[PDB]
Amino acid sequence: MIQRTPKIQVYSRHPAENGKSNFLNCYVSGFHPSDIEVDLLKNGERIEKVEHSDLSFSKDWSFYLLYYTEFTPTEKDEYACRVNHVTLSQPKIVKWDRDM
Amino acid sequence: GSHSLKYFHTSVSRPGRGEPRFISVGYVDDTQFVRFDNDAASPRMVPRAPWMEQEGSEYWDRETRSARDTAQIFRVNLRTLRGYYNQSEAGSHTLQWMHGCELGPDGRFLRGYEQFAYDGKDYLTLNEDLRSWTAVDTAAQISEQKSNDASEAEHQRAYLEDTCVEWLHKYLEKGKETLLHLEPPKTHVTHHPISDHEATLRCWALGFYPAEITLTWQQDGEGHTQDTELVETRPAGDGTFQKWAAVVVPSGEEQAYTCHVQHEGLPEPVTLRW
Amino acid sequence: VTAPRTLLL
């Protein structure tokens, strides 16, 4: 039994352009086992209708998935990704920062 | 060039809800083109690329059986392993298998490989010569002899050596466009000051394909500063990738720094300055 | 194509 904690990166498809439509991404990787919970958040609320890719893993056998949804950056709206996994005491939330 | 045809299989046992989950995703270097998901609304092998749509029933049916049969053996396998480890049937476990073949820049077989892992760890690896196995555990040894007495490396080698290379060829062809097309990195630096006397410089590479890329921050000649924070290359979500390197600089000194960006889709390296 | 047969462990 080996466990690896997820690495998270919240980040949009195209550079953040207030009012300009985009795509919000939560990229989770390097985790084991493969059971993971990922939610996209909009001002604390969980965004419905999010999407993700096909489970896959990398050379060190760790898994990775991309969760995403279409969205529109705003200077006020607060976005985040919330992740859960056995290796985590409690869900981890990482905020989108258009600078990353 | 240089190419690889590779598959990744995963089986995860599901205590309460019977039959384990079996996923299978195939790749022609960096581009997923098929997948089988016994969970999916269609437990069949489906194309994940569009250049694959031009494929006839025979293929899909055949590959659907293959994945189904693997799912089956993998279910047997997960049982056996639960045994070798004297494990309760009430917990979940993962059997993973990765296998692939590679071509020489010269277009023929280069190397082939194969490996299994259980609960996240190496378990049985097919050796370089492709005629032997290396257990990694002692349970794995039983799997190892079982394997040799059965002659599995033999089969695996054939596949790995012909079949695999032969089809990679055919896939490269049917993916002429997509596959052989490189997309260079849109690039740029950004300034985000930390203290009264220093800021962060962030070199950005966006929209590139394939994913191999190299970002380096060097100041006026010599290389690599005290701190280059470099995020794991990531997927944009459109086929392309993104990546960035950051370094902390004393205000004023911002052009003592230059970022170099390397990428196959670039006739030549690119330098950026804030 | 995936490999025709898998190892029985």
mmCIF file of C-alpha atoms in Angstrom:
data_model
loop_
_atom_site.group_PDB
_atom_site.id
_atom_site.type_symbol
_atom_site.label_atom_id
_atom_site.label_comp_id
_atom_site.label_asym_id
_atom_site.label_seq_id
_atom_site.Cartn_x
_atom_site.Cartn_y
_atom_site.Cartn_z
ATOM 1 C CA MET A 1 0.000 0.000 0.000
ATOM 2 C CA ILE A 2 1.535 3.185 -1.271
ATOM 3 C CA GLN A 3 -0.241 6.594 -1.119
ATOM 4 C CA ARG A 4 0.799 9.807 -2.793
ATOM 5 C CA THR A 5 -0.843 13.146 -2.151
ATOM 6 C CA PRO A 6 -2.437 15.131 -4.936
ATOM 7 C CA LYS A 7 -0.764 18.214 -6.387
ATOM 8 C CA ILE A 8 -3.225 20.846 -7.364
ATOM 9 C CA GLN A 9 -3.076 23.778 -9.906
ATOM 10 C CA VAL A 10 -6.057 25.999 -10.554
ATOM 11 C CA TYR A 11 -5.612 27.947 -13.655
ATOM 12 C CA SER A 12 -7.588 29.078 -16.732
ATOM 13 C CA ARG A 13 -7.150 28.020 -20.501
ATOM 14 C CA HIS A 14 -6.430 31.527 -21.693
ATOM 15 C CA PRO A 15 -5.130 34.510 -19.913
ATOM 16 C CA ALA A 16 -7.657 35.936 -17.520
ATOM 17 C CA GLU A 17 -9.567 38.652 -19.315
ATOM 18 C CA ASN A 18 -12.373 40.198 -17.108
ATOM 19 C CA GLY A 19 -15.616 39.765 -19.125
ATOM 20 C CA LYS A 20 -13.843 37.689 -21.758
ATOM 21 C CA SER A 21 -15.196 34.093 -21.649
ATOM 22 C CA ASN A 22 -12.750 31.344 -20.751
ATOM 23 C CA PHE A 23 -12.196 27.906 -19.240
ATOM 24 C CA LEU A 24 -11.359 27.298 -15.580
ATOM 25 C CA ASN A 25 -9.071 24.372 -14.817
ATOM 26 C CA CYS A 26 -8.251 22.319 -11.729
ATOM 27 C CA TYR A 27 -5.403 19.944 -12.520
ATOM 28 C CA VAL A 28 -4.789 17.214 -9.990
ATOM 29 C CA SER A 29 -1.895 14.878 -10.263
ATOM 30 C CA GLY A 30 0.602 12.501 -8.687
ATOM 31 C CA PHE A 31 -1.893 10.858 -6.396
ATOM 32 C CA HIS A 32 -2.481 7.271 -5.333
ATOM 33 C CA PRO A 33 -4.935 5.770 -4.902
ATOM 34 C CA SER A 34 -7.248 6.930 -7.604
ATOM 35 C CA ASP A 35 -10.314 7.920 -5.583
ATOM 36 C CA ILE A 36 -10.465 11.685 -5.515
ATOM 37 C CA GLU A 37 -13.050 14.381 -5.112
ATOM 38 C CA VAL A 38 -12.680 17.564 -7.035
ATOM 39 C CA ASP A 39 -15.073 20.495 -7.088
ATOM 40 C CA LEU A 40 -14.782 23.809 -8.843
ATOM 41 C CA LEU A 41 -15.956 26.577 -6.615
ATOM 42 C CA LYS A 42 -17.494 30.014 -7.401
ATOM 43 C CA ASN A 43 -17.454 32.189 -4.325
ATOM 44 C CA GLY A 44 -17.577 29.115 -2.115
ATOM 45 C CA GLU A 45 -20.414 27.462 -4.018
ATOM 46 C CA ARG A 46 -19.830 24.308 -5.988
ATOM 47 C CA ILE A 47 -20.145 24.923 -9.716
ATOM 48 C CA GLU A 48 -22.412 22.374 -11.331
ATOM 49 C CA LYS A 49 -21.870 20.739 -14.714
ATOM 50 C CA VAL A 50 -17.980 20.494 -14.428
ATOM 51 C CA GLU A 51 -16.079 18.085 -16.580
ATOM 52 C CA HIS A 52 -12.986 15.927 -16.313
ATOM 53 C CA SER A 53 -10.701 13.798 -18.469
ATOM 54 C CA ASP A 54 -10.139 10.026 -18.563
ATOM 55 C CA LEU A 55 -8.356 8.633 -15.634
ATOM 56 C CA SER A 56 -4.783 8.073 -16.475
ATOM 57 C CA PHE A 57 -1.509 7.705 -14.758
ATOM 58 C CA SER A 58 2.075 8.507 -15.309
ATOM 59 C CA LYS A 59 5.358 6.611 -15.179
ATOM 60 C CA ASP A 60 5.606 6.527 -11.395
ATOM 61 C CA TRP A 61 2.100 5.143 -11.567
ATOM 62 C CA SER A 62 0.470 8.186 -10.083
ATOM 63 C CA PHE A 63 -2.805 9.369 -11.431
ATOM 64 C CA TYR A 64 -3.855 12.696 -12.894
ATOM 65 C CA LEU A 65 -7.084 14.274 -14.096
ATOM 66 C CA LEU A 66 -8.110 17.665 -15.367
ATOM 67 C CA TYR A 67 -11.416 19.033 -14.152
ATOM 68 C CA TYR A 68 -12.787 22.109 -15.870
ATOM 69 C CA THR A 69 -15.659 24.271 -16.772
ATOM 70 C CA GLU A 70 -16.430 27.221 -18.918
ATOM 71 C CA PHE A 71 -16.427 30.536 -17.104
ATOM 72 C CA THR A 72 -16.047 34.285 -17.075
ATOM 73 C CA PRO A 73 -13.459 35.948 -14.947
ATOM 74 C CA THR A 74 -14.576 39.044 -13.059
ATOM 75 C CA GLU A 75 -12.652 41.323 -10.813
ATOM 76 C CA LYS A 76 -15.002 40.514 -7.994
ATOM 77 C CA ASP A 77 -15.922 36.858 -8.288
ATOM 78 C CA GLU A 78 -13.805 34.477 -6.174
ATOM 79 C CA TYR A 79 -12.899 31.048 -7.834
ATOM 80 C CA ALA A 80 -11.358 27.907 -6.284
ATOM 81 C CA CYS A 81 -10.831 24.181 -6.537
ATOM 82 C CA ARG A 82 -11.656 21.931 -3.615
ATOM 83 C CA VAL A 83 -9.937 18.491 -3.486
ATOM 84 C CA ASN A 84 -10.338 15.458 -1.314
ATOM 85 C CA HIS A 85 -8.315 12.386 -0.925
ATOM 86 C CA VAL A 86 -7.300 9.788 1.622
ATOM 87 C CA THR A 87 -3.984 11.468 2.024
ATOM 88 C CA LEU A 88 -5.679 14.715 3.185
ATOM 89 C CA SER A 89 -6.819 15.534 6.705
ATOM 90 C CA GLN A 90 -9.492 17.714 5.225
ATOM 91 C CA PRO A 91 -10.251 18.970 1.802
ATOM 92 C CA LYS A 92 -7.688 21.266 0.454
ATOM 93 C CA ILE A 93 -8.933 24.416 -1.345
ATOM 94 C CA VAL A 94 -6.779 26.290 -3.747
ATOM 95 C CA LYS A 95 -7.910 29.626 -5.062
ATOM 96 C CA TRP A 96 -7.642 30.651 -8.605
ATOM 97 C CA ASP A 97 -5.176 33.483 -8.985
ATOM 98 C CA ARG A 98 -5.196 34.684 -12.580
ATOM 99 C CA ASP A 99 -1.489 35.288 -12.183
ATOM 100 C CA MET A 100 -0.790 31.534 -12.156
ATOM 101 C CA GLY B 1 11.099 12.216 -35.090
ATOM 102 C CA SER B 2 10.901 9.268 -32.535
ATOM 103 C CA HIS B 3 7.594 7.723 -31.515
ATOM 104 C CA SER B 4 5.866 5.511 -29.027
ATOM 105 C CA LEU B 5 2.632 3.519 -28.918
ATOM 106 C CA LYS B 6 1.667 3.005 -25.291
ATOM 107 C CA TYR B 7 -1.155 1.745 -23.139
ATOM 108 C CA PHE B 8 -2.030 2.311 -19.500
ATOM 109 C CA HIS B 9 -4.480 -0.096 -17.767
ATOM 110 C CA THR B 10 -6.003 0.292 -14.312
ATOM 111 C CA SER B 11 -8.217 -2.010 -12.355
ATOM 112 C CA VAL B 12 -9.691 -0.968 -9.101
ATOM 113 C CA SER B 13 -11.580 -3.415 -6.914
ATOM 114 C CA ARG B 14 -14.903 -2.281 -5.580
ATOM 115 C CA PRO B 15 -15.852 -4.242 -2.385
ATOM 116 C CA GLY B 16 -19.535 -3.388 -1.853
ATOM 117 C CA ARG B 17 -20.456 -2.906 -5.581
ATOM 118 C CA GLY B 18 -18.951 -6.112 -6.992
ATOM 119 C CA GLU B 19 -17.046 -6.195 -10.326
ATOM 120 C CA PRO B 20 -13.842 -4.034 -10.255
ATOM 121 C CA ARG B 21 -13.545 -0.895 -12.396
ATOM 122 C CA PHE B 22 -11.275 -1.356 -15.372
ATOM 123 C CA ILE B 23 -9.887 1.540 -17.361
ATOM 124 C CA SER B 24 -7.709 1.396 -20.306
ATOM 125 C CA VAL B 25 -6.224 4.522 -22.248
ATOM 126 C CA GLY B 26 -3.943 4.277 -25.263
ATOM 127 C CA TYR B 27 -1.450 6.809 -26.586
ATOM 128 C CA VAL B 28 0.648 7.669 -29.634
ATOM 129 C CA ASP B 29 3.157 9.772 -27.766
ATOM 130 C CA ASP B 30 1.304 12.384 -25.757
ATOM 131 C CA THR B 31 -1.991 12.040 -27.683
ATOM 132 C CA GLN B 32 -4.623 9.764 -26.316
ATOM 133 C CA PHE B 33 -6.414 8.153 -29.122
ATOM 134 C CA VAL B 34 -8.532 5.366 -27.603
ATOM 135 C CA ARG B 35 -9.899 4.309 -24.286
ATOM 136 C CA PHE B 36 -11.952 1.565 -22.760
ATOM 137 C CA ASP B 37 -13.885 2.150 -19.668
ATOM 138 C CA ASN B 38 -15.884 -0.733 -18.325
ATOM 139 C CA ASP B 39 -17.787 1.861 -16.367
ATOM 140 C CA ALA B 40 -18.564 4.172 -19.176
ATOM 141 C CA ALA B 41 -22.103 4.253 -20.533
ATOM 142 C CA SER B 42 -20.539 2.270 -23.438
ATOM 143 C CA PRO B 43 -18.242 -0.638 -22.096
ATOM 144 C CA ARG B 44 -16.504 -0.674 -25.451
ATOM 145 C CA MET B 45 -13.284 0.565 -26.881
ATOM 146 C CA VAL B 46 -13.887 4.060 -28.259
ATOM 147 C CA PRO B 47 -11.788 6.498 -30.283
ATOM 148 C CA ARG B 48 -10.547 9.564 -28.386
ATOM 149 C CA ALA B 49 -9.004 11.249 -31.283
ATOM 150 C CA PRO B 50 -10.834 12.252 -34.453
ATOM 151 C CA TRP B 51 -8.322 10.778 -36.834
ATOM 152 C CA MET B 52 -9.365 7.488 -35.241
ATOM 153 C CA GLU B 53 -13.116 7.904 -36.361
ATOM 154 C CA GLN B 54 -12.072 6.538 -39.759
ATOM 155 C CA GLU B 55 -11.810 3.062 -38.349
ATOM 156 C CA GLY B 56 -14.013 0.069 -39.192
ATOM 157 C CA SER B 57 -16.185 -2.122 -36.834
ATOM 158 C CA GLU B 58 -13.721 -5.001 -37.093
ATOM 159 C CA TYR B 59 -11.170 -2.904 -35.202
ATOM 160 C CA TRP B 60 -13.459 -1.568 -32.549
ATOM 161 C CA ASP B 61 -15.028 -4.948 -31.958
ATOM 162 C CA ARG B 62 -11.669 -6.656 -31.693
ATOM 163 C CA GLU B 63 -10.205 -4.056 -29.361
ATOM 164 C CA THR B 64 -13.355 -4.199 -27.354
ATOM 165 C CA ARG B 65 -12.817 -7.901 -26.780
ATOM 166 C CA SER B 66 -9.192 -7.379 -25.860
ATOM 167 C CA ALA B 67 -10.017 -4.856 -23.257
ATOM 168 C CA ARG B 68 -12.818 -7.031 -21.953
ATOM 169 C CA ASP B 69 -10.578 -10.082 -21.715
ATOM 170 C CA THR B 70 -7.950 -8.028 -19.911
ATOM 171 C CA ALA B 71 -10.490 -6.735 -17.570
ATOM 172 C CA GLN B 72 -11.341 -10.362 -16.885
ATOM 173 C CA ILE B 73 -7.806 -11.626 -16.295
ATOM 174 C CA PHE B 74 -7.181 -8.480 -14.224
ATOM 175 C CA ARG B 75 -10.106 -9.479 -12.038
ATOM 176 C CA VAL B 76 -8.660 -12.902 -11.606
ATOM 177 C CA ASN B 77 -5.325 -11.274 -10.998
ATOM 178 C CA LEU B 78 -6.699 -8.970 -8.341
ATOM 179 C CA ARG B 79 -8.037 -12.005 -6.526
ATOM 180 C CA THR B 80 -4.758 -13.920 -6.689
ATOM 181 C CA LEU B 81 -2.953 -10.893 -5.287
ATOM 182 C CA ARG B 82 -5.404 -10.441 -2.534
ATOM 183 C CA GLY B 83 -4.343 -13.980 -1.664
ATOM 184 C CA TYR B 84 -0.595 -13.634 -1.894
ATOM 185 C CA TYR B 85 -0.969 -10.769 0.510
ATOM 186 C CA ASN B 86 -3.484 -12.489 2.753
ATOM 187 C CA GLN B 87 -5.895 -9.604 2.273
ATOM 188 C CA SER B 88 -9.425 -8.920 3.189
ATOM 189 C CA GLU B 89 -11.886 -8.782 0.295
ATOM 190 C CA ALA B 90 -13.538 -5.795 1.921
ATOM 191 C CA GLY B 91 -10.840 -3.287 0.951
ATOM 192 C CA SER B 92 -10.010 -1.775 -2.395
ATOM 193 C CA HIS B 93 -6.871 -2.476 -4.479
ATOM 194 C CA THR B 94 -5.403 -1.372 -7.723
ATOM 195 C CA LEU B 95 -3.674 -3.329 -10.383
ATOM 196 C CA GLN B 96 -1.951 -1.186 -13.017
ATOM 197 C CA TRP B 97 -0.169 -2.238 -16.139
ATOM 198 C CA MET B 98 1.726 -0.077 -18.527
ATOM 199 C CA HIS B 99 3.258 -1.266 -21.753
ATOM 200 C CA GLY B 100 4.680 0.457 -24.781
ATOM 201 C CA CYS B 101 6.982 0.308 -27.809
ATOM 202 C CA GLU B 102 9.327 2.977 -29.208
ATOM 203 C CA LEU B 103 10.749 3.809 -32.607
ATOM 204 C CA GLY B 104 14.284 4.961 -33.472
ATOM 205 C CA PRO B 105 14.532 8.575 -35.006
ATOM 206 C CA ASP B 106 15.233 6.152 -37.919
ATOM 207 C CA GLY B 107 11.627 4.726 -37.778
ATOM 208 C CA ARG B 108 12.098 1.108 -36.473
ATOM 209 C CA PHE B 109 11.846 -0.760 -33.134
ATOM 210 C CA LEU B 110 14.003 0.937 -30.536
ATOM 211 C CA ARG B 111 13.074 -0.461 -27.082
ATOM 212 C CA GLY B 112 9.863 -1.991 -25.663
ATOM 213 C CA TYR B 113 8.707 -2.237 -22.044
ATOM 214 C CA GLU B 114 6.185 -3.654 -19.699
ATOM 215 C CA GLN B 115 5.319 -3.366 -15.966
ATOM 216 C CA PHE B 116 2.719 -4.130 -13.389
ATOM 217 C CA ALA B 117 2.143 -2.414 -10.110
ATOM 218 C CA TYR B 118 -0.208 -3.274 -7.313
ATOM 219 C CA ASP B 119 -1.466 -0.866 -4.623
ATOM 220 C CA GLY B 120 0.726 1.740 -6.011
ATOM 221 C CA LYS B 121 4.002 -0.074 -6.140
ATOM 222 C CA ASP B 122 6.190 -1.917 -8.567
ATOM 223 C CA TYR B 123 5.371 -5.590 -8.712
ATOM 224 C CA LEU B 124 6.669 -7.325 -11.804
ATOM 225 C CA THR B 125 8.717 -5.920 -14.495
ATOM 226 C CA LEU B 126 9.511 -7.410 -17.870
ATOM 227 C CA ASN B 127 13.297 -7.040 -18.295
ATOM 228 C CA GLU B 128 15.197 -5.159 -20.921
ATOM 229 C CA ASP B 129 16.111 -8.224 -22.955
ATOM 230 C CA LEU B 130 12.340 -8.806 -23.018
ATOM 231 C CA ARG B 131 12.784 -12.485 -22.224
ATOM 232 C CA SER B 132 12.657 -12.274 -18.409
ATOM 233 C CA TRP B 133 10.851 -10.874 -15.318
ATOM 234 C CA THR B 134 11.990 -9.253 -12.121
ATOM 235 C CA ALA B 135 9.711 -9.734 -9.188
ATOM 236 C CA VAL B 136 9.905 -6.949 -6.665
ATOM 237 C CA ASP B 137 8.324 -8.719 -3.821
ATOM 238 C CA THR B 138 8.213 -12.323 -2.793
ATOM 239 C CA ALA B 139 4.577 -12.686 -3.898
ATOM 240 C CA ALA B 140 5.871 -11.290 -7.010
ATOM 241 C CA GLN B 141 8.209 -14.194 -7.155
ATOM 242 C CA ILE B 142 5.379 -16.578 -7.422
ATOM 243 C CA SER B 143 4.025 -14.386 -10.160
ATOM 244 C CA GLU B 144 7.479 -14.458 -11.602
ATOM 245 C CA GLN B 145 7.877 -18.220 -11.893
ATOM 246 C CA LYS B 146 4.323 -18.705 -12.931
ATOM 247 C CA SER B 147 5.147 -16.278 -15.625
ATOM 248 C CA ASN B 148 8.268 -17.945 -16.877
ATOM 249 C CA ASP B 149 6.991 -21.489 -16.821
ATOM 250 C CA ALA B 150 4.052 -20.059 -18.906
ATOM 251 C CA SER B 151 6.294 -18.321 -21.370
ATOM 252 C CA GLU B 152 4.618 -14.907 -21.132
ATOM 253 C CA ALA B 153 7.696 -12.842 -22.028
ATOM 254 C CA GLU B 154 7.638 -14.687 -25.377
ATOM 255 C CA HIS B 155 4.223 -13.336 -26.341
ATOM 256 C CA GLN B 156 4.897 -9.987 -24.838
ATOM 257 C CA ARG B 157 7.966 -9.760 -26.884
ATOM 258 C CA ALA B 158 6.269 -10.479 -30.142
ATOM 259 C CA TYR B 159 3.642 -7.908 -29.513
ATOM 260 C CA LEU B 160 6.114 -5.461 -28.292
ATOM 261 C CA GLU B 161 8.401 -6.039 -31.228
ATOM 262 C CA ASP B 162 6.081 -6.235 -34.238
ATOM 263 C CA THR B 163 2.471 -5.686 -33.672
ATOM 264 C CA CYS B 164 3.125 -2.695 -31.517
ATOM 265 C CA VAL B 165 5.636 -1.044 -33.905
ATOM 266 C CA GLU B 166 3.615 -2.061 -36.990
ATOM 267 C CA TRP B 167 0.438 -0.305 -35.734
ATOM 268 C CA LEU B 168 2.261 2.725 -34.385
ATOM 269 C CA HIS B 169 3.190 3.180 -38.036
ATOM 270 C CA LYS B 170 -0.372 2.911 -39.162
ATOM 271 C CA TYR B 171 -1.465 5.374 -36.444
ATOM 272 C CA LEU B 172 1.187 7.917 -37.302
ATOM 273 C CA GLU B 173 -0.206 7.736 -40.803
ATOM 274 C CA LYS B 174 -3.877 8.142 -39.891
ATOM 275 C CA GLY B 175 -2.791 11.047 -37.644
ATOM 276 C CA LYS B 176 -0.464 12.618 -40.211
ATOM 277 C CA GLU B 177 -1.835 16.025 -39.474
ATOM 278 C CA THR B 178 -2.384 16.315 -35.699
ATOM 279 C CA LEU B 179 0.500 14.067 -34.770
ATOM 280 C CA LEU B 180 3.300 15.480 -36.769
ATOM 281 C CA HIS B 181 2.311 19.032 -36.149
ATOM 282 C CA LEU B 182 4.190 21.119 -33.699
ATOM 283 C CA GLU B 183 2.706 24.232 -31.941
ATOM 284 C CA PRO B 184 5.202 26.691 -30.449
ATOM 285 C CA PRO B 185 4.761 28.519 -27.198
ATOM 286 C CA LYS B 186 3.185 31.972 -27.029
ATOM 287 C CA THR B 187 5.578 33.561 -24.539
ATOM 288 C CA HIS B 188 5.876 36.437 -22.060
ATOM 289 C CA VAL B 189 7.172 37.796 -18.831
ATOM 290 C CA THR B 190 5.221 39.263 -15.930
ATOM 291 C CA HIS B 191 6.101 41.401 -12.989
ATOM 292 C CA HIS B 192 4.572 40.920 -9.555
ATOM 293 C CA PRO B 193 6.529 42.817 -6.875
ATOM 294 C CA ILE B 194 6.917 41.365 -3.397
ATOM 295 C CA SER B 195 8.664 43.899 -1.120
ATOM 296 C CA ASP B 196 9.654 47.557 -1.435
ATOM 297 C CA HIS B 197 12.904 46.252 -2.963
ATOM 298 C CA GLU B 198 12.033 43.128 -4.989
ATOM 299 C CA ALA B 199 9.555 41.503 -7.301
ATOM 300 C CA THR B 200 8.802 38.186 -8.947
ATOM 301 C CA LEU B 201 9.489 37.756 -12.591
ATOM 302 C CA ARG B 202 7.330 34.989 -14.218
ATOM 303 C CA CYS B 203 8.228 33.612 -17.633
ATOM 304 C CA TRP B 204 5.150 32.077 -19.342
ATOM 305 C CA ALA B 205 4.786 29.556 -22.116
ATOM 306 C CA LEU B 206 1.189 28.959 -23.294
ATOM 307 C CA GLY B 207 -0.550 26.871 -25.946
ATOM 308 C CA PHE B 208 2.455 24.648 -26.928
ATOM 309 C CA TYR B 209 2.452 21.012 -28.316
ATOM 310 C CA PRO B 210 3.989 18.607 -27.778
ATOM 311 C CA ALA B 211 4.502 19.060 -24.002
ATOM 312 C CA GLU B 212 8.276 18.790 -23.712
ATOM 313 C CA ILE B 213 9.476 22.351 -23.084
ATOM 314 C CA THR B 214 12.349 24.008 -21.195
ATOM 315 C CA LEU B 215 12.232 27.358 -19.365
ATOM 316 C CA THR B 216 15.296 28.957 -17.905
ATOM 317 C CA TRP B 217 15.903 32.214 -16.116
ATOM 318 C CA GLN B 218 19.483 33.458 -16.365
ATOM 319 C CA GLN B 219 20.892 36.842 -15.567
ATOM 320 C CA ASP B 220 23.248 38.707 -17.900
ATOM 321 C CA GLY B 221 25.274 35.737 -19.158
ATOM 322 C CA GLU B 222 25.778 32.954 -16.589
ATOM 323 C CA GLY B 223 22.961 30.603 -15.423
ATOM 324 C CA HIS B 224 20.201 29.380 -13.066
ATOM 325 C CA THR B 225 19.248 31.640 -10.163
ATOM 326 C CA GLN B 226 18.834 30.821 -6.505
ATOM 327 C CA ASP B 227 15.295 30.318 -7.175
ATOM 328 C CA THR B 228 13.560 29.317 -10.182
ATOM 329 C CA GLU B 229 10.098 28.104 -9.188
ATOM 330 C CA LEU B 230 8.963 25.977 -12.026
ATOM 331 C CA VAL B 231 5.386 24.551 -12.091
ATOM 332 C CA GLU B 232 4.735 21.152 -13.489
ATOM 333 C CA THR B 233 3.878 21.463 -17.158
ATOM 334 C CA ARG B 234 0.102 21.432 -17.475
ATOM 335 C CA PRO B 235 -2.734 20.867 -19.854
ATOM 336 C CA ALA B 236 -4.682 23.885 -21.154
ATOM 337 C CA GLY B 237 -7.567 21.672 -22.022
ATOM 338 C CA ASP B 238 -7.423 22.113 -25.759
ATOM 339 C CA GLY B 239 -4.607 19.805 -26.765
ATOM 340 C CA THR B 240 -1.884 22.207 -25.818
ATOM 341 C CA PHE B 241 0.106 22.812 -22.595
ATOM 342 C CA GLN B 242 1.224 25.664 -20.309
ATOM 343 C CA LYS B 243 4.237 26.168 -18.080
ATOM 344 C CA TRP B 244 6.025 28.900 -16.257
ATOM 345 C CA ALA B 245 9.135 29.712 -14.379
ATOM 346 C CA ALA B 246 9.435 32.295 -11.709
ATOM 347 C CA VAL B 247 12.472 33.978 -10.106
ATOM 348 C CA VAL B 248 12.750 36.727 -7.464
ATOM 349 C CA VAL B 249 14.617 39.835 -8.373
ATOM 350 C CA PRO B 250 15.599 43.197 -6.616
ATOM 351 C CA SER B 251 13.635 46.021 -8.193
ATOM 352 C CA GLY B 252 15.578 47.911 -10.819
ATOM 353 C CA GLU B 253 17.495 44.735 -11.859
ATOM 354 C CA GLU B 254 14.618 43.300 -13.977
ATOM 355 C CA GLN B 255 16.589 43.266 -17.274
ATOM 356 C CA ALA B 256 19.710 41.805 -15.790
ATOM 357 C CA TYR B 257 17.315 38.813 -16.268
ATOM 358 C CA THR B 258 16.464 36.859 -19.355
ATOM 359 C CA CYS B 259 14.283 33.797 -19.800
ATOM 360 C CA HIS B 260 15.117 31.187 -22.446
ATOM 361 C CA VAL B 261 12.440 29.106 -23.910
ATOM 362 C CA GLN B 262 13.131 25.785 -25.748
ATOM 363 C CA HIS B 263 10.581 23.972 -27.810
ATOM 364 C CA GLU B 264 10.429 21.825 -30.895
ATOM 365 C CA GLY B 265 7.954 24.133 -32.540
ATOM 366 C CA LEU B 266 10.482 26.939 -32.388
ATOM 367 C CA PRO B 267 12.862 27.325 -35.377
ATOM 368 C CA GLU B 268 15.198 28.482 -32.579
ATOM 369 C CA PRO B 269 15.280 29.193 -28.866
ATOM 370 C CA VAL B 270 13.450 32.295 -27.690
ATOM 371 C CA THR B 271 14.709 34.918 -25.171
ATOM 372 C CA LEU B 272 12.468 37.111 -23.097
ATOM 373 C CA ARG B 273 13.085 40.074 -20.991
ATOM 374 C CA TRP B 274 10.724 42.002 -18.937
ATOM 375 C CA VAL C 1 -3.749 -2.099 -30.687
ATOM 376 C CA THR C 2 -3.487 -3.143 -27.050
ATOM 377 C CA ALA C 3 -1.592 -6.455 -26.639
ATOM 378 C CA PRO C 4 -3.545 -9.641 -27.460
ATOM 379 C CA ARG C 5 -3.147 -11.251 -24.060
ATOM 380 C CA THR C 6 -2.185 -10.169 -20.563
ATOM 381 C CA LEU C 7 -0.102 -11.917 -17.890
ATOM 382 C CA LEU C 8 -1.903 -14.138 -15.416
ATOM 383 C CA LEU C 9 -0.301 -13.340 -12.055
#
